[PDB]
Write a protein that binds this ligand. Structure first.
Ligand SMILES: [Ba+2]
Ligand SMILES: [Ba+2]
Ligand SMILES: [K+]
Ligand SMILES: [K+]
Ligand SMILES: [K+]
Lengths: 91, 91, 91, 91
């Protein structure tokens, strides 16, 4: 479960990285950063896509990727972080 | 369910698109982009409504539209994305 | 329930409005706008508090107000929006 | 529970404060502010990490810290705010 969610998140992020570095001309790391803050709904305070293609893609990217990214964060904290803490609270 | 949620989301987004392109003078695609990043809580890093009418509308737009948009994203991933993946994990 | 949540949200927003218009010198409507986009986690693309007092308050404002604001949005859509739609889907 | 969540949130925020004030050169209060608005997904409208180290850290910081921060906000409102209000609604 966590593995599949992990793999799906990676693939989604790779897709955004390729798109923004190609269409919006961002350096790869910046495209990855934008993809991450966008899907986690944190938001980027400086960059906004400048092309109409970038705007449409971002809109679709958001609706399709948010559910996945949060499903991953949800399990990452509940089934991988909670225990390491919970079992650690045991005297 | 997913259909109704889909239709309701579209109508909400169309409303924002019309409002911002008319009151804030944004190009239609930009008004749609702003409506989308606002309701998904991602946020726009460059634009903020400039008129008092735009600010009040955005405030009300947020409170009324967030619940809907996320109800749609929730089902879009759970009742339309999960299966295509779940049934796909079956050897 | 919805009434109490409504009243609590209003009081929280009034507090932010007074704080930002006084300490950060924002026009009242702008202080209200900032308070709203901050507590709904949408975020403001142009303004960030400039004083250390504004930064500390915003930090505490966020932790205390997000839960409330979303509890209100949750009920606003589930116990006030769902029905108006659900009962409306009945032929 | 609330205590542990509180302590874990503090440690996470201290880590971000140290990182951004050191690598991105932000004043401590600004580093704390950025760490807070980032993990609560509110977002900062003016600052974005400028170094590649800052971008990578923020990406990892987000995935690991969001779950915790919201687990804390969830309990802060449900097991510490709800009662003070609920028991207060009793005539
Ligand atoms: Ba900006
Ligand atoms: Ba945001
Ligand atoms: K958000
Ligand atoms: K934002
Ligand atoms: K922003």
């Amino acid at each position: 479960e966590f593995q599949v969610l992990f793999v799906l998140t990676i693939l989604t992020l790779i897709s955004g990285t390729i798109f923004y570095s190609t269409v919006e001309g961002l350096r790869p790391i910046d495209a990855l950063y934008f993809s991450v803050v966008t899907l986690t709904t944190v938001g980027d305070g400086n960059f906004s896509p400048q092309t109409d293609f970038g705007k449409i893609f971002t809109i679709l990217y958001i609706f399709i990727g948010i559910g996945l990214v949060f499903g991953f964060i949800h399990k990452l904290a509940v089934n991988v972080q909670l225990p390491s803490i919970l079992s650690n609270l045991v005297p």
